[PDB]
Design a protein around this ligand. Structure first.
Ligand SMILES: [Cl-]
Ligand SMILES: [Cl-]
Ligand SMILES: [Cl-]
Ligand SMILES: [Cl-]
Lengths: 315, 314
């Protein structure tokens, strides 16, 4: 009866793990009442058009971060990898459900005809590169695929952010068009084959957890009967849950036992310059609007409270 | 289809740890199937709960293995296996990636029960009327806890006491319970135990309780595919909700809660408890091959966390 098309930010090999299992489950349960067809990175429309395509109803739903999509909202810069925002993946659903971020995202997207269904965590952000990164100077001049706001941050350190479609990254790494990636953690690197075409993995992250969401065109959302609305919401939470343990398990296991990437580390005392720079970056963002200031203050109070709480949040 | 589920949780706790997902299931399933949810000891007492499900009097159960004393080789790892998990996410990873799901499934299938899914709940902390500032202060304390964690704690002079969950609040404000070692701070505030205790010891004896959804195997096999899948997804939703409910609650209440004063035993002193837990695991391992295999999985997992480093270990 009801037919949706969903496009995800994830390339095909990544979609197999971060969206497909929950959509397949939705489809097995819904049966003839409703089916969701899942399309991967840049398949139905280009990234630059993803948000507008959903808004106007060409595509019914989207799984994506705000930042790569360049959504016309005040919270776009907090999606993807907001530098040093969340130490832990569970910080994301806690910030959204308990510290007010859900209501802010709902309002921002509704103003533009889109239903924010649910936010979730993905992986930490690490450099994986052809050449080893052992110091901050080693970052200078490197052409790396990353997210827009993270890239803007990293530019302070001489990184050159380069944007290409996801399906092209593997060959771009192979030819040296890219010097590396700062788009993902180690789980994705091994799963999607990027570990096969890069050599080194830097242990110092610039975010403990990517922020992405499920979104639906508001008119399509309002057309849903209640039981299918609830079924979609639950399947999306199942998708988020699966990612919580897929990444928690994958990052540790592959760091310790993987053999396709050699680990490097920048000394803490040196990396502290990157953390310092990040809090100036947050201030620059807060300067830009009231909503941005509000969200930055929430990130600050949350992180300050983690320090006061102690173990196992902070040591 | 008509099912009755009984949870280990008291009524005030069940509102957070089972009811939302069962209500969602019921709204989605409609006339196809309904699950009536009962709380702690409501249809049958805890000590009869496993056999009641096995026999089919009750169709489904939300519980740890330990408090209902399931007759299996893995029962001692449910609830609060001392120092087994530092983090809540360790539970679904151990189950889904390090083989514990298949072991639980085989063990329960043997005794007529479907293990549907495991999940994490909260860390285990002492909440008490008098302050704990040293190990000697543990001696003599009558506390509500789980059977296996209680057997461990007994070596330190702790008196594990087993009462029905709904009786605990009054036992604390009046009459020989000196405290609880059954929960973390989120439950303590939510269910009212923080109103009748004064102190919260920051040194946990486990970072994450292990519980599960179980179904009578005959009832499980009778389910239509679509309803089985719906039940499984709603259970995962319940686990997800608890992952963030506890992650958010423990920190917030430690920092902003006004009802319990935080105390700490020095790390050097608390090392004695960690040492004793090591010995406890070895005792368990020696009891059977299945126990030995599970203990080895916990040891290897914790070893690999130290090798992995941040943010798993610092
Ligand atoms: Cl998924
Ligand atoms: Cl959300
Ligand atoms: Cl629930
Ligand atoms: Cl499981």
């Amino acid at each position: 009866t009801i037919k949706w098309r969903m496009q995800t930010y994830a390339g095909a090999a990544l979609a197999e793990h971060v969206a497909k299992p929950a959509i397949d489950l939705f489809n097995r349960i819904a049966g003839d009442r409703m089916q969701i067809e899942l399309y991967s990175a840049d398949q139905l429309v280009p990234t630059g058009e993803l948000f507008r395509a959903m808004q106007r109803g060409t595509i019914d739903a989207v799984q994506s971060d705000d930042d790569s999509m360049a959504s016309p909202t005040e919270v776009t810069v907090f999606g993807g990898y907001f530098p040093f925002g969340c130490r832990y993946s569970l910080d994301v659903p806690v910030l959204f459900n308990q510290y007010g971020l859900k209501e802010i995202w709902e309002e921002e997207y509704a103003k533009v005809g889109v239903k924010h269904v649910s936010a979730g965590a993905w992986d930490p952000c690490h450099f994986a590169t052809k050449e080893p990164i052992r110091s901050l100077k080693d970052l200078e001049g490197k052409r790396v695929f990353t997210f827009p706001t993270a890239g803007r941050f990293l530019s302070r350190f001489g990184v050159v952010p380069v944007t290409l479609p996801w399906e092209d990254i593997e060959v771009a790494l192979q030819t040296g068009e890219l010097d590396g990636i700062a788009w993902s953690g180690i789980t994705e690197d091994y799963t999607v084959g990027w570990a096969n075409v890069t050599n080194y993995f830097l242990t110092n992250n610039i975010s403990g957890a990517w922020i992405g969401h499920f979104f639906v065109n508001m008119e399509r959302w309002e057309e849903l009967p209640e039981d299918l609305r609830l079924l979609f919401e639950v399947c999306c939470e199942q998708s988020h849950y699966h990612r919580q343990y897929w990444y928690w398990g994958g990052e540790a296991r592959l760091r310790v036992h993987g053999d396709k990437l050699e680990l490097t580390s920048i000394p803490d005392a040196e990396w502290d310059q990157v953390e310092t720079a990040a809090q100036e970056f947050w201030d620059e963002i807060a300067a830009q609007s009231e909503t941005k200031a509000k969200v930055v203050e929430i990130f600050k109070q949350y992180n300050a409270d983690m320090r006061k709480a102690g173990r196992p949040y902070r040591y």
